Design a protein around this ligand. Structure first.
Ligand code: VW7
Ligand code: VW7
Lengths: 178, 245
């Protein structure tokens, strides 16, 4: 089994920690949702190839510009996250996160991931966003941003229900192998 | 880690660690506060364990089995003894606060009501100065350690056999040399996330809310100081490259 490294980036409220927890446990925690994620090495078999995929979170490093890049050495795939209930998290992708990852991880594939997709049809989310003249991120808005930033691909998931979670990590493994 | 502490922190949460008859005696808000405090101590136990793998399994194993050039082991594991001393002392204090709080006749039922003061003490005075000095040094030597590791693994047969031998057991799956270095660098930025969530469930006693608010400010001050004091060292970097930073 070959070893590959994955790092997840995105704004503090993008759901990156939850996404790593749910994938690594293959379950949305029923009793306690952890505050933090240390690391994990997932055994994944994608398209007949066995890989040990090491998973890392950048949560807590968002305000520390000299500590945060220490998470990037030898990264093989980047998951660049935004929350579908937060158009503001999508706006920070093209000129903050994208140029940073392209600088420290040249030629590393980036997958743009739209997290919390279950909130797209959540009435409380729609009412709250309508107060700031906003709405949940549309699928075409996600795809267009991924196209614009030169992402390897665009994917959506919900850590809450687990829908799309496995597919994101299997695709990330495929990207890391290219 | 020692068996006693591993068993005490084996459960996924405080609510699953204590007896169900003891859990039933508390309000929901106390359970939520205790679950986050348990996560802080449990992750500190694991961090101290990462430092022991670095000092005892890797560092000492290389000194006693390999013929590496002098100063090579220090370059692979900068500040590990100082880091181990800081966190083993902090872990000792957290575990003693839990132990003092146990109900008579129990080795698992406890409630920690006064964590704030312990966190203010850890993140102020001489201990904060030592954490700041040690992490500014460690984090500035992070890239150099990874590059030295990669060079040795690729060119030294005896080094490669040593690494493959001591990292083979399944319990070392997440703890290779590079993984340990990144786990240590990431530890300090986990504290504000945990402390903020403990603070969210500590409004019941105004002195406690005030103490955790002070501790959270001190941890952020420390992180800002460490982040401002970092500059990656590079083997073979010339003075001209440095003064043209
Ligand atoms: C979302 C998750 O997985 N854990 C979690 C739970 C609750 C809070 C307040 C929090 C976190 C993560 C870091 C920020 N604060
Ligand atoms: C921490 C750091 O140096 N980030 C970084 C590196 C390179 C570029 C171009 C860039 C960033 C930050 C967002 C804007 N562009």
């Amino acid at each position: 089994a070959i070893r590959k490294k994955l790092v997840i980036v995105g704004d503090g409220a993008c759901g990156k920690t939850c996404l790593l927890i749910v994938f690594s446990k293959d379950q949305f925690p029923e009793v306690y949702v952890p505050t933090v994620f240390e690391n994990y090495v997932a055994d994944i078999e994608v398209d007949g190839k066995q890989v040990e995929l090491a998973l890392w979170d950048t949560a807590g490093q968002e305000d520390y510009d000299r500590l945060r890049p220490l998470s990037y050495p030898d990264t093989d795939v980047i998951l660049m996250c935004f929350s579908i209930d937060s158009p503001d998290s999508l706006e920070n992708i093209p000129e903050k996160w994208t140029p940073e990852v392209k600088h420290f991880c040249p030629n590393v594939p980036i997958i743009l991931v739209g997290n919390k997709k279950d909130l797209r049809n959540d009435e409380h989310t729609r009412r709250e966003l309508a107060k700031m003249k906003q709405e949940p991120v549309k699928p075409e808005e996600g795809r267009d941003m991924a196209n614009r930033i030169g992402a390897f691909g665009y994917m959506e998931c919900s850590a809450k229900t687990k829908d799309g979670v496995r597919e994101v990590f299997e695709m990330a493994t495929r990207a890391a192998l290219q | 880690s020692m068996e006693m502490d591993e068993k005490d922190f084996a459960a996924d949460s405080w609510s699953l660690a204590v007896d169900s008859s003891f859990l039933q005696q508390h309000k929901k808000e106390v359970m939520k506060q205790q679950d986050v405090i348990y996560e802080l101590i449990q992750t500190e136990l694991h961090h101290v364990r990462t430092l022991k793998i670095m000092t005892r399994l890797f560092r000492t194993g290389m000194l006693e089995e390999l013929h590496l050039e002098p100063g090579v082991v220090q370059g692979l594991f900068p500040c590990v003894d100082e880091l181990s001393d800081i966190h083993t002392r902090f872990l000792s204090q957290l575990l003693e606060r839990r132990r003092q709080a146990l109900c008579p006749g129990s080795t698992r039922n406890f409630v920690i009501h006064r964590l704030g003061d312990l966190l203010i003490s850890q993140f102020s005075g001489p201990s904060a100065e030592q954490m700041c000095k040690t992490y500014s040094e460690f984090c500035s030597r992070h890239s150099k350690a990874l590059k030295l590791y990669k060079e040795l693994y690729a060119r030294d047969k005896r080094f490669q056999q040593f690494i493959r031998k001591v990292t083979r057991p399944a319990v070392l799956k997440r703890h290779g040399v590079q993984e340990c270095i990144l786990l240590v660098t990431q530890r300090i930025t986990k504290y504000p996330l945990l402390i903020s969530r403990i603070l969210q469930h500590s409004h019941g006693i105004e002195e406690e809310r005030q103490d955790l608010t002070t501790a959270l400010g001190l941890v952020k001050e420390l992180l800002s100081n460490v982040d401002e004091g970092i500059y990656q060292l590079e083997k073979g970097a010339r003075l001209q490259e440095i003064y043209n930073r």
